[PDB]
Amino acid sequence: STPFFYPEAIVLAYLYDNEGIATYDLYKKVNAEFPMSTATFYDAKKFLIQEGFVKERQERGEKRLYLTEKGKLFAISLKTAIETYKQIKKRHHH
């Protein structure tokens, strides 16, 4: 489900500008716009950590997400794509 982006792409895009977010809150946010399961969401967190786009730290009584140098770069161009997608969907509910 959801064309054209996999979960790793959405999760990555959403993290941009939300560094510091507790992991599960990032899930709530993503899910509010692009519904996915926690299984699918965590699979994506796993992957982006493993491929060196995202870092997860236990800070201030929570596990939180930061972007990586290569994540920060990629996240921006993904955001622009998903965002344009969202606006294309809105434009065209006809």
Added chain:
Amino acid sequence: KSTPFFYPEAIVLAYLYDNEGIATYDLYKKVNAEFPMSTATFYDAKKFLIQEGFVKERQERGEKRLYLTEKGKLFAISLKTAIETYKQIK
């Protein structure tokens, strides 16, 4: 299936920008060079892009020709940016 961030539709659509008027078969080959995928997968993606209105098929010049709708034109640009950025990061 294969590639991480992008579903075949996304790759297909990005690659069609502006190889507009490419023969379908030839778009397959181009796509397959950087993003190996089966024809089954490719044609699935062609089907979807036409049915959700990003792409149109017309027979021109004795060939199956793929073109971008207006919706597809806006979207392909932003997609190609992301894929390009991805390739440069790999």
